Amino acid sequence: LVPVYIYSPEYVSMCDSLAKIPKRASMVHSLIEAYALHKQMRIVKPKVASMEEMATFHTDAYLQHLQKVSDSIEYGLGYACPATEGIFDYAAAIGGATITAAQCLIDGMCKVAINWSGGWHHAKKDEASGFCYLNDAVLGILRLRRKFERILYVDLDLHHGDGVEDAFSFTSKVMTVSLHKFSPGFFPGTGDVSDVGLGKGRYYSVNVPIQDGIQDEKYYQICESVLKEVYQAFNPKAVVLQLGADTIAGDPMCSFNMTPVGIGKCLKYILQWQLATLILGGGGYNLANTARCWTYLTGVILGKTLSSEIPDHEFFTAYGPDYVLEITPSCRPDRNEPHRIQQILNYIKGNLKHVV
Ligand SMILES: CN(C)c1ccc(C(=O)NCCCCCCC(=O)NO)cc1
Ligand SMILES: [K+]
Ligand SMILES: [K+]
Ligand SMILES: [Zn+2]
C-alpha cells in the first residue's frame, strides 16, 4: 500500500546528462529527499530496457539508427533531438525506468508507481520528436496491457501528447485525454477538440484545447468535468498520468498560469478512483519550480502536507528570492473566453456518449 519510487544514483546521474534540462533530476530528487518523503515510499532501482522491450513500439530500423548514432535528418535527429553520443543508453534507461514502474502495478506491489524523469510523450514509432528519442509512456502502457484491459492516459503537460495519442488512435483498449495549449504555431500543432481518433478508435481520444492565462480554479473545473464523463463512459482499469510542470507559472514557456495546487486537485480526483496509477513527469523549464511542483505532488500522493520553508540541501541557493514551496501566479490576463470553454466541454460530452 506504499507508493513505489523509481530511484537510483546511477539513474539520476544518467538523466542529468540531457542537455535540455541539466541537473533537473538531481534537483527534483534532492528536494523530495530533503523533505524526507522517500522515507514513506518503496524505493526501487530501475532496470535498463532491453532492445526487445523497446521494439514493442519502436521499429528496428529506428532503434538500430538511434544506436548507430549513439542521414539522421530522416529520423528527426537534428535541432530538437540532437544526434548526441549516448542518447541511446540514455533513452534505454528512461524507457526501462517506466517499464520497471509498470511491472510493480501489475504485481500488486503497490497501487501507485512514480518516475518523474519519464514522460517523453512526443516520440513516434520510428521518429524522434520534441526532445524525445524514445516513448516511455507508450512502453509503459503496452506493459500494463499484460494485465489490464482498459488503460486511461491523462496528459496534463503544457503540450499535446501527440506521440502517445497516435500510438493508440486506432484502438479503444487505451483512451487518451490531453489538456494542452492549442494555437497556430505552437508545438506540436495538433490536438484540436475535433480530433477524436480513427477507425475502431473513434471517440477514444479526447482533446481539450486551451489558451494562455488559465489559472487553477478555471483549470480544475475543466479537468474535473471531463475526467468525470470519461470515468463514466470508459470505466478504466488502470491509469497513466503525465504531469509536465511547464504549465506552472514562472516557466520560461510563459503560457498557462497554474501553481502545483491546481494540478494537485486534479491528481487527487484521479487518485480517488483507487485504480492502479503510474505517475510521470515531462516538460518543465524553470528547474527550481519543477522541483517545487513534483515534490508538492509527491506530497499529495502521500497525504502529507509539506512545510512552506524550503529545507536546506545541495540546491538550496536556487530557490531565491523567497525560498518557499508555494508559487505565486503572474499578473497577466486569462485569455479563455468562458463561452468557448463551454462549447468545447459540450462537444466533448456529446463525443463520450458514443462510448459503449
Ligand atoms: C533556445 N531555446 C530556448 C529553444 C530552442 C528550440 C526550441 C524548439 O525547437 N522547440 C520545439 C519543441 C519543444 C519541445 C517541448 C517539449 C514539451 O514540453 N513537451 O511537452 C525551443 C526553445
Ligand atoms: K485510443
Ligand atoms: K497535455
Ligand atoms: Zn511540455
Coordinates of C-alpha atoms and ligand atoms in Angstrom, one line a residue:
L1 CA 0.0 0.0 0.0
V2 CA 3.2 2.2 -0.1
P3 CA 3.9 4.1 -3.3
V4 CA 6.9 2.9 -5.4
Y5 CA 9.6 5.4 -6.2
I6 CA 11.9 4.7 -9.1
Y7 CA 15.2 6.0 -7.7
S8 CA 18.9 5.1 -8.2
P9 CA 22.1 7.2 -8.1
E10 CA 23.2 5.7 -11.5
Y11 CA 19.7 6.6 -13.0
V12 CA 19.5 10.2 -11.7
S13 CA 23.1 10.9 -13.0
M14 CA 22.1 9.4 -16.3
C15 CA 19.1 11.7 -16.6
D16 CA 21.1 14.8 -15.6
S17 CA 23.0 14.3 -18.9
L18 CA 20.2 15.5 -21.1
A19 CA 21.3 19.0 -22.3
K20 CA 17.8 20.4 -22.5
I21 CA 17.3 20.2 -18.7
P22 CA 20.8 20.0 -17.0
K23 CA 20.6 18.7 -13.4
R24 CA 16.8 18.8 -13.2
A25 CA 16.7 15.2 -12.0
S26 CA 19.1 15.8 -9.0
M27 CA 17.1 18.9 -8.1
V28 CA 13.8 17.1 -8.1
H29 CA 15.1 14.1 -6.2
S30 CA 17.1 16.2 -3.8
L31 CA 14.1 18.4 -2.8
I32 CA 12.0 15.3 -2.4
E33 CA 14.6 13.8 -0.1
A34 CA 15.2 17.0 1.8
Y35 CA 11.5 16.7 2.8
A36 CA 12.4 13.0 3.6
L37 CA 9.4 11.8 1.6
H38 CA 11.4 8.9 0.2
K39 CA 11.1 7.8 3.8
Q40 CA 7.5 6.9 3.2
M41 CA 7.9 5.2 -0.1
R42 CA 9.2 1.9 -1.6
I43 CA 12.5 2.9 -3.3
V44 CA 13.0 0.7 -6.3
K45 CA 16.1 0.5 -8.6
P46 CA 15.1 0.7 -12.3
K47 CA 16.2 -2.0 -14.8
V48 CA 17.7 -0.8 -18.1
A49 CA 15.3 -1.5 -21.0
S50 CA 16.2 -4.3 -23.4
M51 CA 16.2 -3.9 -27.2
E52 CA 13.3 -6.4 -27.3
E53 CA 11.2 -4.3 -24.9
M54 CA 11.8 -1.0 -26.9
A55 CA 10.9 -2.9 -30.0
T56 CA 7.4 -3.4 -28.7
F57 CA 6.7 0.1 -30.0
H58 CA 9.7 1.5 -32.0
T59 CA 10.9 0.0 -35.2
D60 CA 14.3 -1.8 -35.5
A61 CA 15.3 0.5 -38.3
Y62 CA 14.8 3.4 -35.9
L63 CA 16.3 1.6 -32.9
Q64 CA 19.3 0.5 -35.0
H65 CA 19.8 4.1 -36.1
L66 CA 19.4 5.5 -32.6
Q67 CA 22.1 3.0 -31.6
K68 CA 24.4 3.7 -34.6
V69 CA 24.2 7.4 -33.8
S70 CA 25.0 6.8 -30.1
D71 CA 21.0 10.7 -42.8
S72 CA 19.9 11.2 -39.2
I73 CA 17.8 14.0 -40.6
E74 CA 15.5 11.2 -41.6
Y75 CA 14.6 10.1 -38.0
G76 CA 14.1 13.6 -36.6
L77 CA 17.6 13.6 -35.2
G78 CA 18.6 17.3 -35.6
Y79 CA 17.9 20.6 -33.8
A80 CA 15.3 19.5 -31.3
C81 CA 16.6 15.9 -31.0
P82 CA 20.4 16.0 -31.5
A83 CA 22.5 13.0 -32.5
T84 CA 24.3 13.2 -29.2
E85 CA 26.7 10.5 -28.1
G86 CA 25.0 8.3 -25.6
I87 CA 21.3 9.2 -26.2
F88 CA 20.6 5.6 -26.9
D89 CA 21.9 4.5 -23.5
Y90 CA 20.0 7.5 -22.0
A91 CA 16.7 6.6 -23.7
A92 CA 17.1 2.9 -22.6
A93 CA 17.4 3.9 -19.0
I94 CA 14.3 6.1 -19.1
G95 CA 12.2 3.5 -21.1
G96 CA 13.2 0.7 -18.7
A97 CA 12.5 3.0 -15.7
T98 CA 8.9 3.4 -16.8
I99 CA 8.6 -0.3 -17.7
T100 CA 10.1 -1.2 -14.3
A101 CA 7.4 1.0 -12.7
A102 CA 4.6 -0.5 -14.7
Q103 CA 5.5 -4.1 -13.7
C104 CA 5.1 -3.1 -10.0
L105 CA 1.5 -2.1 -10.6
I106 CA 0.8 -5.5 -12.2
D107 CA 2.3 -7.2 -9.2
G108 CA 0.0 -5.6 -6.5
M109 CA 3.4 -4.4 -5.1
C110 CA 1.7 -1.0 -4.8
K111 CA -1.3 1.0 -6.1
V112 CA 0.9 3.9 -7.3
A113 CA 4.4 4.0 -9.0
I114 CA 6.5 7.1 -9.7
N115 CA 9.1 8.1 -12.3
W116 CA 9.5 11.8 -12.6
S117 CA 12.3 11.6 -15.1
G118 CA 9.9 9.9 -17.6
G119 CA 7.0 11.2 -19.6
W120 CA 8.6 11.8 -23.0
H121 CA 5.3 11.9 -25.0
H122 CA 6.2 13.2 -28.4
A123 CA 8.2 10.3 -29.9
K124 CA 6.8 8.4 -32.8
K125 CA 7.3 4.7 -33.6
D126 CA 10.1 5.5 -36.0
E127 CA 10.9 9.1 -35.3
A128 CA 12.2 11.3 -32.6
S129 CA 10.3 14.5 -31.8
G130 CA 10.2 17.4 -29.5
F131 CA 13.3 16.3 -27.5
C132 CA 12.1 12.7 -27.2
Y133 CA 14.2 9.8 -28.7
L134 CA 12.0 7.1 -27.2
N135 CA 8.4 7.0 -25.9
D136 CA 8.4 5.6 -22.4
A137 CA 4.7 6.5 -21.8
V138 CA 3.7 4.1 -24.6
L139 CA 6.2 1.4 -23.4
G140 CA 4.6 1.8 -20.0
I141 CA 1.1 1.4 -21.4
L142 CA 2.0 -1.6 -23.6
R143 CA 3.4 -3.2 -20.4
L144 CA 0.2 -2.6 -18.4
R145 CA -1.8 -4.2 -21.2
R146 CA -0.4 -7.6 -20.0
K147 CA -2.9 -7.5 -17.1
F148 CA -5.2 -4.5 -17.6
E149 CA -7.9 -4.4 -20.3
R150 CA -8.8 -0.7 -20.3
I151 CA -6.0 1.8 -19.6
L152 CA -6.7 5.6 -19.3
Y153 CA -3.9 8.0 -20.2
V154 CA -4.2 11.6 -18.8
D155 CA -1.7 14.1 -20.2
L156 CA -1.5 17.3 -18.1
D157 CA 1.6 18.7 -19.8
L158 CA 1.5 22.1 -21.5
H159 CA 1.9 20.3 -24.9
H160 CA -0.4 17.9 -26.6
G161 CA 0.7 14.4 -26.1
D162 CA 0.6 13.7 -29.8
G163 CA 3.1 10.7 -29.6
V164 CA 1.1 8.6 -27.2
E165 CA -2.2 9.5 -28.9
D166 CA -1.1 8.4 -32.4
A167 CA 0.2 5.2 -30.9
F168 CA -3.3 4.3 -29.8
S169 CA -5.6 6.3 -32.1
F170 CA -6.8 3.1 -33.8
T171 CA -7.8 1.2 -30.7
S172 CA -10.4 1.5 -27.9
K173 CA -8.4 -0.5 -25.4
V174 CA -6.4 2.6 -24.4
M175 CA -8.0 6.0 -24.1
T176 CA -6.1 9.2 -24.1
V177 CA -7.0 12.6 -22.6
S178 CA -4.9 15.7 -23.1
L179 CA -5.4 19.2 -21.7
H180 CA -2.9 21.4 -23.5
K181 CA -2.4 24.8 -25.1
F182 CA -3.7 24.9 -28.7
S183 CA -2.9 27.8 -31.0
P184 CA -1.4 28.1 -34.5
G185 CA 2.3 27.9 -34.5
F186 CA 2.5 26.4 -31.0
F187 CA 4.3 23.0 -30.9
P188 CA 3.3 20.4 -32.0
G189 CA 0.3 21.9 -33.6
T190 CA -2.2 19.1 -33.1
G191 CA -5.0 18.1 -30.8
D192 CA -8.0 20.4 -31.5
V193 CA -11.3 19.4 -29.9
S194 CA -12.4 17.9 -33.3
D195 CA -9.5 15.4 -33.0
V196 CA -11.0 12.2 -31.6
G197 CA -9.3 9.1 -33.1
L198 CA -9.6 6.9 -36.1
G199 CA -11.5 3.7 -37.1
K200 CA -12.2 1.3 -34.3
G201 CA -10.8 4.0 -32.0
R202 CA -13.1 6.8 -32.9
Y203 CA -14.1 8.9 -29.8
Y204 CA -11.5 7.1 -27.7
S205 CA -9.2 10.2 -27.9
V206 CA -10.2 13.3 -26.0
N207 CA -8.5 16.7 -26.6
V208 CA -9.1 19.9 -24.6
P209 CA -7.6 22.9 -26.4
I210 CA -6.8 25.8 -24.1
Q211 CA -5.4 29.4 -24.3
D212 CA -2.9 31.4 -22.2
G213 CA -3.5 32.7 -18.7
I214 CA -5.7 29.9 -17.4
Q215 CA -5.3 29.7 -13.6
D216 CA -6.0 26.9 -11.0
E217 CA -9.8 27.1 -10.5
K218 CA -10.8 27.5 -14.1
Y219 CA -8.4 24.6 -14.9
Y220 CA -9.7 22.2 -12.3
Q221 CA -13.3 22.8 -13.3
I222 CA -12.5 21.9 -16.9
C223 CA -10.4 18.9 -15.9
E224 CA -12.7 17.6 -13.2
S225 CA -15.7 17.9 -15.6
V226 CA -14.0 15.9 -18.4
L227 CA -12.4 13.3 -16.1
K228 CA -15.9 12.8 -14.8
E229 CA -17.6 12.0 -18.2
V230 CA -14.6 9.8 -19.1
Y231 CA -14.7 7.7 -15.9
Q232 CA -18.4 7.2 -16.6
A233 CA -18.3 6.1 -20.3
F234 CA -14.9 4.3 -20.2
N235 CA -14.8 2.9 -16.7
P236 CA -10.9 2.4 -16.8
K237 CA -9.0 -0.4 -15.1
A238 CA -5.6 1.4 -14.7
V239 CA -4.4 5.0 -15.1
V240 CA -1.2 6.5 -16.6
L241 CA -0.7 10.2 -15.7
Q242 CA 1.8 12.6 -17.2
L243 CA 2.4 15.8 -15.2
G244 CA 4.8 18.1 -17.1
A245 CA 5.3 21.2 -15.0
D246 CA 5.7 23.6 -17.9
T247 CA 2.1 24.7 -17.2
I248 CA 3.2 26.2 -13.8
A249 CA 3.6 29.9 -13.5
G250 CA 7.2 31.0 -13.8
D251 CA 8.2 28.6 -16.6
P252 CA 10.1 30.3 -19.4
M253 CA 7.3 28.9 -21.7
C254 CA 5.0 31.7 -20.3
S255 CA 1.7 30.3 -21.4
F256 CA -0.6 28.8 -18.8
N257 CA -0.6 30.3 -15.3
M258 CA -1.0 27.3 -12.8
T259 CA 0.5 26.5 -9.4
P260 CA 1.1 23.0 -8.1
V261 CA -2.1 23.3 -6.0
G262 CA -4.3 23.2 -9.1
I263 CA -2.7 20.2 -10.7
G264 CA -2.8 18.7 -7.2
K265 CA -6.6 18.8 -7.1
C266 CA -6.7 17.1 -10.5
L267 CA -4.3 14.5 -9.1
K268 CA -6.5 14.0 -6.0
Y269 CA -9.5 13.5 -8.2
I270 CA -7.7 10.8 -10.3
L271 CA -6.3 9.0 -7.2
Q272 CA -9.8 8.9 -5.7
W273 CA -10.7 6.1 -8.1
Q274 CA -8.1 3.9 -6.3
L275 CA -7.2 2.3 -9.7
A276 CA -3.5 1.4 -10.3
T277 CA -1.6 4.6 -11.2
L278 CA 1.7 5.3 -13.0
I279 CA 2.9 8.8 -12.3
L280 CA 5.2 10.5 -14.9
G281 CA 6.9 13.9 -15.4
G282 CA 7.7 15.7 -18.7
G283 CA 8.3 19.3 -19.7
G284 CA 9.4 21.8 -17.0
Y285 CA 12.0 24.5 -17.7
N286 CA 12.1 26.6 -14.6
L287 CA 14.3 24.0 -12.7
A288 CA 13.6 25.1 -9.2
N289 CA 9.8 25.4 -9.9
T290 CA 9.6 22.0 -11.4
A291 CA 11.2 20.5 -8.3
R292 CA 8.7 22.6 -6.2
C293 CA 5.9 21.1 -8.2
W294 CA 6.8 17.5 -8.3
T295 CA 7.8 17.5 -4.6
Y296 CA 4.5 19.0 -3.5
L297 CA 2.7 16.4 -5.7
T298 CA 4.8 13.6 -4.3
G299 CA 3.3 15.1 -1.1
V300 CA -0.3 14.9 -2.1
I301 CA 0.3 11.3 -3.3
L302 CA 1.3 10.6 0.4
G303 CA -1.5 12.6 2.0
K304 CA 1.2 14.6 3.9
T305 CA 1.2 18.5 3.8
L306 CA 4.8 19.9 3.4
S307 CA 6.4 22.9 5.1
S308 CA 6.4 26.3 3.3
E309 CA 10.1 26.8 4.0
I310 CA 12.4 25.0 1.6
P311 CA 14.8 22.8 3.6
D312 CA 18.4 23.4 3.2
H313 CA 20.1 20.9 0.8
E314 CA 22.5 20.8 -2.0
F315 CA 20.5 23.2 -4.2
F316 CA 19.0 25.5 -1.6
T317 CA 20.6 28.6 -3.2
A318 CA 18.5 28.0 -6.4
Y319 CA 15.2 28.7 -4.6
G320 CA 15.6 32.5 -4.2
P321 CA 14.5 35.2 -3.7
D322 CA 11.8 33.9 -1.3
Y323 CA 12.9 30.3 -0.6
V324 CA 9.4 28.9 -0.2
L325 CA 7.4 25.9 -1.7
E326 CA 4.5 27.9 -2.9
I327 CA 4.4 29.5 -6.4
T328 CA 2.5 32.8 -7.0
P329 CA 0.6 33.4 -10.2
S330 CA 1.8 36.0 -12.6
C331 CA -0.2 39.2 -13.3
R332 CA -1.5 38.6 -16.8
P333 CA -5.0 38.0 -18.3
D334 CA -6.6 34.7 -18.7
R335 CA -7.5 34.6 -22.5
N336 CA -10.1 31.9 -22.2
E337 CA -13.5 33.4 -23.1
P338 CA -15.9 31.3 -20.8
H339 CA -18.3 30.7 -23.6
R340 CA -15.7 28.8 -25.8
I341 CA -14.8 26.6 -22.8
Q342 CA -18.4 25.5 -22.7
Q343 CA -18.7 24.9 -26.4
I344 CA -15.7 22.6 -26.0
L345 CA -16.9 20.8 -22.9
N346 CA -20.3 20.1 -24.7
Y347 CA -18.6 19.0 -27.9
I348 CA -16.7 16.6 -25.6
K349 CA -19.8 15.5 -23.6
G350 CA -21.5 14.5 -26.9
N351 CA -18.5 12.6 -28.1
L352 CA -18.4 10.5 -24.9
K353 CA -21.9 9.2 -25.4
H354 CA -20.7 7.1 -28.3
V355 CA -18.6 5.0 -26.0
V356 CA -20.3 1.6 -25.3
Ligands
LIG1 C1 16.9 28.2 -27.4 N1 15.6 27.8 -26.9 C2 15.1 28.5 -25.7 C3 14.7 26.9 -27.7 C4 15.3 26.3 -29.0 C5 14.4 25.4 -29.7 C6 13.1 25.1 -29.3 C7 12.3 24.1 -30.1 O1 12.8 23.7 -31.2 N2 11.1 23.8 -29.7 C8 10.1 22.9 -30.3 C9 9.8 21.6 -29.5 C10 9.6 22.0 -28.0 C11 9.5 20.7 -27.1 C12 8.6 20.9 -25.9 C13 8.7 19.6 -25.1 C14 7.5 19.6 -24.1 O2 7.4 20.3 -23.2 N3 6.5 18.7 -24.4 O3 5.5 18.6 -23.7 C15 12.6 25.6 -28.1 C16 13.4 26.5 -27.3
K2 K -7.5 5.5 -28.3
K3 K -1.2 17.9 -22.5
ZN4 ZN 5.6 20.4 -22.5

